[PDB]
Amino acid sequence: ERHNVLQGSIECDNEGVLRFYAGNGISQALSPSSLNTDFADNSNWFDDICDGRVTAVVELKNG
Amino acid sequence: CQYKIYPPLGIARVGNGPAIKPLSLSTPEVPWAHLYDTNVQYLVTQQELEQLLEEAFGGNVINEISQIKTKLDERKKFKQEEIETITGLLGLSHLVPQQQLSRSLDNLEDIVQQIKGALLKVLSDHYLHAVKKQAQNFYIYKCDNPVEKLKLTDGDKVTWRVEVANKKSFWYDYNNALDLSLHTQGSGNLSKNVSKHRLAPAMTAKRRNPNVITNSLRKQLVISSQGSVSSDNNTQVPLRGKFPANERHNVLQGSIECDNEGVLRFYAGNGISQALSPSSLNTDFADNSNWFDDICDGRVTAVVELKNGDTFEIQDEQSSAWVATTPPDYAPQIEPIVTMYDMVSGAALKEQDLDNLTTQFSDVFPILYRLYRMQWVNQADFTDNAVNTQIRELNSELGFAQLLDNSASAKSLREGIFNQFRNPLFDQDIDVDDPSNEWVSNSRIIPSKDETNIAAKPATSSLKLPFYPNDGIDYPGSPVQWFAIPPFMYQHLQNWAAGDFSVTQVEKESANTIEELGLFYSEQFKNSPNSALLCARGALDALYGGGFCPGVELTWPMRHNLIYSQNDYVSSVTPEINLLGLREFRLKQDLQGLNSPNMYQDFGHVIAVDNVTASIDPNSDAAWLWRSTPGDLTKWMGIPWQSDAASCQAVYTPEDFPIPSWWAANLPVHVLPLARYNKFKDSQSADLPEINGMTHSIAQGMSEETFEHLRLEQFSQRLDWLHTADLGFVGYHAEGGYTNGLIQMVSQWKNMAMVMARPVENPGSSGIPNVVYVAYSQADKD
Amino acid sequence: SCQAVYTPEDFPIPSWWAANLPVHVLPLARYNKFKDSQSADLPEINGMTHSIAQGMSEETFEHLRLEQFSQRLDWLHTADLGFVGYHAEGGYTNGLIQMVSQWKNMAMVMARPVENPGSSGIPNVVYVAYSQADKD
Amino acid sequence: NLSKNVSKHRLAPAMTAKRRNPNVITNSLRKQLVISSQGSVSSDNNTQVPLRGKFPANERHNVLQGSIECDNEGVLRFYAGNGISQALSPSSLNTDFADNSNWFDDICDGRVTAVVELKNG
Amino acid sequence: LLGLREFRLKQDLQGLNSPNMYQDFGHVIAVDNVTASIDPNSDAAWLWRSTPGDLTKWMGIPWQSDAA
């Protein structure tokens, strides 16, 4: 019961560039016998697609 | 021949309750011992989890938390370190994963009561209403012929060894019992007519998981494990293999433990069945590729080491034992009409010598008693069985003892009952085509689901008893479509009908009702002095003995004497009371076990009755079939077992009644739910605010006749066992149906109703008996 | 499609339109096992031989009647809607498909008399489902 | 056509096979499952003659198994059926590659004989 | 070019009126019935002495399922 969902990963390099990777492509139902037989709408299923908000703060040497 | 293990074939049933003694069950070691026990608890109860928690909290533990006591107020949440000392002091790691034991108290805010309350919720979530495991005890007996249990003096030690395997995914499809075509003279279990007249021909069968090719790669499909425990340490040892074997899933095949007295306790697995891919669904009753389950069976041996330096190896087949795990028993107090113990008993008999069998009334009483009690699990035996109704008529006038009368004046009464029973010659109620001769039943047939819109031939003979399907189900119009008590039991019944039986006077004096005489016979078992043979019988008396399509626990090889290395009648239960007898039997065993060169044997692309025929000759390259290696007893059964169980229910005929049921004593088909019990268990005088589901005011305002009529209407409502959990039929436009049942049983088996004896304290004139058998699940509770 | 809608809780079973498309009925088979009094002048009485029916106490005889009266049968089972035979699928969808031909075979409920209910609790007028599967 | 090795090394074992339409029991009733017909034509008349049977054999369905005509040279011409296959109930679907209960088709096979009669008798 | 042959089917001369028109082997057919039919004197030899319907009865019913 309850599954870990890797929705993405983030990393920033020395120059301030952010890199965003998506998930592993894991889709699953809460019970093995729930089959995703509809093209769009299957109850009991999750996937690791996501979307959201990207913000930043720049902090200079002078404060 | 110094020491021997009993029972010679132990049985342990899967469940999701824990493998600890207080919360588990034990395979019967005395037949009939608990038939009317209204205190049984076959599902884990709230009270047992509380009492488990209280025992785990005995100081030292309170005092020592009265020291984390002080360090939390020198701090004024917990912290990991003191969390991990609260557990492991409680030692609940073996029952629930440590992770959520730890988060258990991480979320907390009489300090002892927030510990208990939080943990009991974790235990409850995992185990409340769980199917308790039924575990097998194995005993070392001293011999010469078992006299008494080995008693360990200080310095002595007994080491047990167990090796088990599961070969279902390695083995062949189950189409029907291959012995139905095997040439024979006839045994007490199976008449020679079935093969001689081709009444239900054996079908060829292909390999399961046929895409795995070469013997070498097919070994991956076999799950195996082994273990050892001794009387010097009572720590429990798991039996865990891998599937596929050396992906990879861990498979807990069982658990073993030995106490300081040298008794071995064997637990079966947790009931976990699974496919290698989520999308592989188990849509067939028997043969589903890509699946494994945790059923298993194998070899039980021991070494007895005395303080004297003398060591005794119990390793040969005459002294060693076997163990097999099986699906749960959902009505442990309801005995199958013909049992696996009856199969052993009949396998040593020749059909043409049955006229030399002698019969006591206690030899036929089991048939009538079991058939009568089938009313708690099967509608046809509650309301459509004229023998059961006649027994009821006899009980109502305290007249059951007339069935014990072997004189002519009672002959017509005995014949009237015997004549309703199906003859396992399978030669009645038939017309012969072409007298190339086929035997076509002229009684009611069980159609194939593949329909033909041509009017059925009208049946001209009445359907005989019992109303259950049998080995020949695949063949419409075969007399073997329907179950017969086997030849040697039918011969007893025949002798009884004729008057050729004996009975003692003390028996007649406890036979005014069937229940009264059943209690008497149960006392005879409990006071029999051969505890070894009673224990060997108790392991098999709860298991089914037909029909085999493939069955519930075990299947058809068990009904041949070829599978036993020894199978001898020893004595009656009582000096004067046979009760079907006590026997000494042992399975044939491969003494190399898991390391046998025959462990991975098969017959090529198909198995067929020709292979079985060849195996009769003990010199042949096929005789290994009968010399068991771990996994050999259960490999025949359905994979996963939950698909067999879901298809072990009713088989409907075009005629509504009676409804045929497969194996209803162990997999019930129609049950009396808890919800109905709560509407009939109270008498009108109960002083509660609700009385049988009515307000106090309504229940007492009605006439007493009306109150009693409502009790009996409730008692009469029998629910389809398949409806006691969500098997795919719940919800708006749910499909329901056979196949969803098989699919959902993989997860829902552990929620299906469990039948338990319960009291009715004051039945008054309602007609409800004082002991009822009530089906407990979560859906049917109210 | 106009029958039961099952909930996770077993009871009460919700039913759609049961007054015109019944869901649980009292079959003729059961009527023939409670309609007679213990004194009926018939060689078979409520599915028992005369001798067995008149051998039992009157109490248990009346109890047996009410037990038969209390057996209600799924209306969808009064004809072959795809659940009949070895390994038959059954289920909601086969019902829909088979009702096209089987609608004319489903059980029809009709008032019938009980001449001497006695103390059994069965009313003098019962409503009984007649079909061909439904017979005995 | 077939090597000895197939059987001798058990390369593809024969399976047992159950009856089609297994709910029809007794030989006498199973005769109804068989569709048959016959007819004759001669070189004195080229009218075509249908071969029409019934399924089930004595609602019944007419099954045109084929048609025969003979020309004035004495050549017989045989025509197969129209390709019509059907179940006894419309809900009976032919979901198996070979064995579908409740179905009949108009394929057929049988015996062809003749008599020659010359002027002199 | 693989040659020319004179061949004829084994035929039951009573055709539709044959006592063997409606013969079978019981609940199943198996290779053992075919073994017994090899001997033209045996009880199972009728399998090779064709009556009408005998050549096509083996094929799929209806033929359209086998074609598909």
Ligand SMILES: [Mg+2]
């Ligand atoms: Mg049972």
